[PDB]
Amino acid sequence: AFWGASNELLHDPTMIKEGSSWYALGTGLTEERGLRVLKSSDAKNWTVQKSIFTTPLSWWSNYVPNYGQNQWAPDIQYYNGKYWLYYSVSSFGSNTSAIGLASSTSISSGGWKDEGLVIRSTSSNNYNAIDPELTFDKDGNPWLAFGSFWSGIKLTKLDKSTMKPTGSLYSIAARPNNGGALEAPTLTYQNGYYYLMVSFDKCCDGVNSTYKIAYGRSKSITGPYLDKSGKSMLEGGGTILDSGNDQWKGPGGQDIVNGNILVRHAYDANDNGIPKLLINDLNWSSGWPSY
Ligand SMILES: [Ca+2]
Ligand SMILES: [Ca+2]
């Protein structure tokens, strides 16, 4: 079922439970520094907390010299006794970007240790190092998906002791004939399959907001991810979970929480087109994700 939509603005959400509260994190407000943090007791009515990175980290300028003041598209998990917070440092439209990592033993305390650079991109790369997603393979070991535009969604294994990349960089979703207009991966292993969801974006309106949520599955984490029709996500495949409705436009930025909750943003046609946090239960019983 549909849990509801938030009061508070949130874009590119991730969410996690800590004690008697839920925390939802998102892209920082454009006019502020850092990452946006919301807290609630009911996952519906949220209060805005002090942001993460109200002070920027000094190393960011070494990789993204004219980074925008807000950081983007956080991702969080608790693993091996710590919270791991991946996030994006970038500037609007650019593929000169970096994904950073911070760690904590408590979200409510608001203390984060800088773990440094995860992966970066420059104009010389055919991908954009934003929109991280931490996932776990069938052996419980960590991997990172990321990407936005250019040749699309990438995947690397992570070293379980440093939480940074190891091995080769794999390609797992692309839209070669629609301008590379996809972003924001989320990836989970359920019932013997790897599932990849991505946001398909508008390619051609000069704004490139999210538009639909699309999915595919694969027996191996490195793909190919195939949609319900059998089409590979590397060739623009992806079955549409959600294309919005009368009130809620451009759903995207989706993240799978606890295996069976889907959070996402969508833009409120009844409230100035502001992106809000929408949450549904997720069912996998069909072989595929469903509301
Ligand atoms: Ca995300
Ligand atoms: Ca996630």
Swiss-Prot record:
<dbReference type="GO" id="GO:0046872">
    <property type="term" value="F:metal ion binding"/>
</dbReference>
<feature type="binding site">
    <location>
        <position position="133"/>
    </location>
    <ligand>
        <name>Ca(2+)</name>
    </ligand>
</feature>
<feature type="active site" description="Proton acceptor">
    <location>
        <position position="12"/>
    </location>
</feature>
<dbReference type="InterPro" id="IPR016840">
    <property type="entry name" value="Glyco_hydro_43_endo_a_Ara-ase"/>
</dbReference>
<comment type="function">
    <text>Involved in the degradation of arabinan and is a key enzyme in the complete degradation of the plant cell wall. Catalyzes the internal cleavage of alpha-(1-&gt;5)-L-arabinofuranosyl residues of linear 1,5-alpha-L-arabinan and of branched sugar beet arabinan. It displays no activity against heavily substituted arabinans or a range of other polysaccharides (larch wood arabinogalactan, wheat arabinoxylan and p-nitrophenyl-alpha-L-arabinofuranoside). The enzyme activity is progressively reduced as alpha-(1-&gt;5)-chains become shorter or more highly substituted.</text>
</comment>
<feature type="binding site">
    <location>
        <begin position="148"/>
        <end position="150"/>
    </location>
    <ligand>
        <name>substrate</name>
    </ligand>
</feature>
<keyword id="KW-0479">Metal-binding</keyword>
<dbReference type="GO" id="GO:0031222">
    <property type="term" value="P:arabinan catabolic process"/>
</dbReference>
<keyword id="KW-0106">Calcium</keyword>
<dbReference type="GO" id="GO:0046558">
    <property type="term" value="F:arabinan endo-1,5-alpha-L-arabinosidase activity"/>
</dbReference>
<feature type="site" description="Important for catalytic activity, responsible for pKa modulation of the active site Glu and correct orientation of both the proton donor and substrate">
    <location>
        <position position="131"/>
    </location>
</feature>
<keyword id="KW-0119">Carbohydrate metabolism</keyword>
<dbReference type="GO" id="GO:0005576">
    <property type="term" value="C:extracellular region"/>
</dbReference>
<dbReference type="Pfam" id="PF04616">
    <property type="entry name" value="Glyco_hydro_43"/>
</dbReference>
<comment type="pathway">
    <text>Glycan metabolism; L-arabinan degradation.</text>
</comment>
<feature type="binding site">
    <location>
        <position position="12"/>
    </location>
    <ligand>
        <name>substrate</name>
    </ligand>
</feature>
<feature type="binding site">
    <location>
        <position position="93"/>
    </location>
    <ligand>
        <name>substrate</name>
    </ligand>
</feature>
<protein>
    <recommendedName>
        <fullName>Extracellular endo-alpha-(1-&gt;5)-L-arabinanase 1</fullName>
        <ecNumber>3.2.1.99</ecNumber>
    </recommendedName>
</protein>
<keyword id="KW-0378">Hydrolase</keyword>
<dbReference type="InterPro" id="IPR006710">
    <property type="entry name" value="Glyco_hydro_43"/>
</dbReference>
<keyword id="KW-0326">Glycosidase</keyword>
<feature type="binding site">
    <location>
        <position position="255"/>
    </location>
    <ligand>
        <name>Ca(2+)</name>
    </ligand>
</feature>
<feature type="active site" description="Proton donor">
    <location>
        <position position="183"/>
    </location>
</feature>
<keyword id="KW-0732">Signal</keyword>
<dbReference type="InterPro" id="IPR050727">
    <property type="entry name" value="GH43_arabinanases"/>
</dbReference>
<comment type="similarity">
    <text>Belongs to the glycosyl hydrolase 43 family.</text>
</comment>
<feature type="binding site">
    <location>
        <begin position="128"/>
        <end position="131"/>
    </location>
    <ligand>
        <name>substrate</name>
    </ligand>
</feature>
<dbReference type="InterPro" id="IPR023296">
    <property type="entry name" value="Glyco_hydro_beta-prop_sf"/>
</dbReference>
<feature type="binding site">
    <location>
        <position position="75"/>
    </location>
    <ligand>
        <name>Ca(2+)</name>
    </ligand>
</feature>
<keyword id="KW-0964">Secreted</keyword>
